[PDB]
Amino acid sequence: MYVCLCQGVTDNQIRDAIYEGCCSYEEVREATGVGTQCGKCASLAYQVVRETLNDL
Ligand code: FES
């Protein structure tokens, strides 16, 4: 699903960044651009990051 429409980031793309070593929401933002242009997606993006990290 889409997480971030401003940057076109999907939940799979967030997981891809974590599977390449990102270990925090901030690093996922650095790798994907999620949440950089407005406030709408931050809550969802953080939840996807946390669920993904907890499953590793
Ligand atoms: S929807 Fe993600 S930065 Fe705007």
TrEMBL record:
This chain belongs to the protein called: Bacterioferritin-associated ferredoxin
Native organism is Pseudomonas aeruginosa
State start and end of the fragment within the whole protein.
Answer: 1 to 56 of 73
User: Which family is it part of?
Assistant: Belongs to the Bfd family.
Highest taxon in the source lineage: Bacteria
> Which gene does this sequence derive from?
bfd
Instruction: Cite the GO molecular-function annotations of the record.
Output: 2 iron, 2 sulfur cluster binding; metal ion binding
Q: Which segments constitute the BFD-like [2Fe-2S]-binding domain?
A: 2-49
Q: Which UniProt keywords apply?
A: 2Fe-2S, Electron transport, Iron, Iron-sulfur, Metal-binding, Transport
The Swiss-Prot or TrEMBL record lists the needed cofactor(s) as:
[2Fe-2S] cluster
